[PDB]
Amino acid sequence: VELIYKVCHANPSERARFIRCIYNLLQSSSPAVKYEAAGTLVTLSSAPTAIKAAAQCYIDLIIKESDNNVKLIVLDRLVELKEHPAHERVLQDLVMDILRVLSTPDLEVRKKTLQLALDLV
């Protein structure tokens, strides 16, 4: 017997069902910002660069939902980390620069990152 009216009431078991129940009550344009899904998810690619590369992808997606032309593919939500105020301190673009890569982190993360610079902006 699953689905609660509450937030919880306690314990890992209730907690595990709860992220399933949350995805129901907001399906809309992926989870966007991953819920209690995040904990199992890292181990799913323990070998080792692939986690960061994946993580980088989600973080880029999350920033904004742009036009979505050829390699401008960022989904998730339109505003939830914006892009580009001129009063924002120390700005969004600092994280965007990582994604522009020569190899600036390692090659698996690099391939993901170049696509990801292209994708947000």
Partner: protein, 135 residues
């Protein structure tokens, strides 16, 4: 059943000791354990790895794999937790994993397997509980 078998493996290419809760996986147990646990259950040093459509959960100990296998699943936390409790119970019987000492305490381990997981549903065990049985 949700849990096909609970199995201790040697990656010598055979299931060293294993438990079939109800008559289903007899000989089947040895072939699965023998192929898959050799490759680290085909893992990459990840506790969950699934191969040939069977979920394998594992922990390496030496040349040996302590293995839990399921092909169905009720909850995330649970599969690990029976394996984990098993891993408290196994060095009490065999002083880590090692094929010869695992072999000698087939009875000990096997009995724990029946007690721990009953008709594929993960019951709980503890080293003191285990004692009443082998007394």
């Amino acid at each position: 059943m949700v849990l096909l078998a609970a199995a201790v493996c040697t990656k010598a290419g055979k299931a060293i000791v294993s438990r079939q809760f109800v008559e289903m996986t007899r000989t089947r147990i040895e072939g699965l354990l023998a192929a898959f646990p050799k490759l680290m259950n085909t893992g990459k040093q990840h506790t969950f790895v699934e191969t040939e459509s069977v979920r394998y959960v594992y922990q390496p100990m030496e040349k040996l794999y302590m293995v839990l296998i399921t092909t169905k699943n009720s909850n995330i936390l649970e599969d690990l937790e029976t394996l984990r409790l098993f891993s408290r119970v196994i060095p009490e019987y065999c002083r880590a994993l090692e094929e010869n000492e695992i072999s000698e305490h087939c009875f000990d381990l096997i009995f724990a397997f029946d007690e721990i997981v009953a008709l594929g549903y993960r019951e709980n065990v503890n080293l003191a509980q285990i004692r009443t049985f082998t007394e």
